[PDB]
């Protein structure tokens, strides 16, 4: 053929779907705003959590001392006296 009859549909192939572009734009806005709200919530967390000491890793002694309160140097004076019988 001639030049323009091919350059026309060439440019038309080069250009994209606008419906896809609009859908992607509204989508991206939706999830970006949702993620923005999520990050805003995340930044509100205090440095020290409400539980803190309640956490099992932050006790480390309520389940260690009971198995140590029997060794010498930690016993209540009234433990060795009546342990004989």
């Amino acid at each position: 053929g001639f030049i323009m009859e091919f350059a026309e549909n060439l440019v038309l192939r080069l250009m994209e779907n606008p419906e896809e572009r609009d859908r992607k734009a509204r989508e991206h806005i939706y999830e970006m705003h949702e993620r923005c709200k999520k990050i805003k919530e995340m930044w509100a967390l205090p440095i020290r959590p409400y539980g803190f000491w309640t956490f099992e890793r932050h006790n480390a002694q309520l389940r260690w001392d009971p198995q140590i309160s029997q060794v010498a140097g930690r016993r209540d004076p009234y433990d060795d006296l009546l342990e004989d019988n």
Partner: protein
């Protein structure tokens, strides 16, 4: 029994390698067969290899190093923060010891005790990150402090090195005394040297409701000592002279 030490291998290995390097250097620096060889670069390369190996040990023990946490509770408490902090400090030490090899032979400074002291101060630092008590905190501070006091005055020909070493010594000793005096009263007013139980007796009541003149001033002295340690203004009495 032995498996309770799976959480201390990244440190036991570095101590053992430090001892082996010290023995090898002292044995083969006075041998008449080899005519007193300059084995500073050799010890440095072996120390870099040891640092790499203990880094590999530390990196692959991520699921480990948290076992027997009740047994080690009174001594140290290592976790994800400690794991990454140690794995980065050890990399920094490896890079520093690697970029100083040419310094040993360019200006003919074949003292292998430099490398062993770097390694042992690095072990002290590894103790510090895991340290979870005032006593271990202070002892791990003192390890690196004494290593650096020794190392700073190593080059004993220049008036700068000796005077800077002495100034670093005096400033660090004063800072350590200040920090230790700070910890003494926090122990006195509450007991509970351990960090876990120190964070639980102080969270109960705010300082604003009632004033405790002991805990506040002990915390202040600990902070002052730490600011001396990092040379933070106005506690920067001699730091530029130390670094020069």
């Amino acid at each position: 029994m032995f498996n309770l030490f799976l959480a201390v291998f990244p440190e036991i290995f570095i101590i053992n390698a430090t001892f082996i390097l010290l023995i090898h250097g002292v044995v083969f620096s006075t041998s008449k067969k080899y005519d007193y060889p300059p084995l500073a670069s050799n010890v440095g390369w072996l120390g870099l290899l040891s640092v790499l190996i203990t880094l590999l040990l530390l990196a692959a023990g991520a699921p480990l190093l948290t076992i027997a946490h009740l047994f080690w509770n009174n001594l140290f408490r290592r976790d994800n923060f400690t794991y990454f902090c140690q794995i980065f400090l050890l990399l920094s030490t490896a890079g520093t010891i690697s970029m100083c090899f040419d310094f040993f032979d360019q200006e003919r400074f074949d003292a292998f005790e430099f490398i062993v002291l770097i390694l042992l101060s690095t072990c002290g630092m590894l103790f510090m990150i895991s340290a979870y008590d005032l006593i271990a905190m202070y002892l791990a501070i003192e390890l690196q402090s004494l290593c650096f006091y020794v190392i700073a005055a190593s080059k004993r020909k220049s008036e700068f090195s000796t005077e800077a070493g002495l100034k670093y010594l005096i400033l660090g000793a004063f800072s350590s005394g200040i920090l230790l005096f700070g910890c003494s009263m926090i122990y006195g007013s509450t007991g509970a040297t351990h960090f876990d139980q120190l964070a639980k007796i102080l969270t109960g009541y705010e300082i604003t409701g009632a004033r405790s003149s002991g805990i506040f001033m002990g915390i202040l002295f600990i902070a002052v000592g730490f600011l001396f340690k990092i040379t933070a203004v106005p506690f920067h009495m001699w730091a530029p002279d130390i670094y020069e």
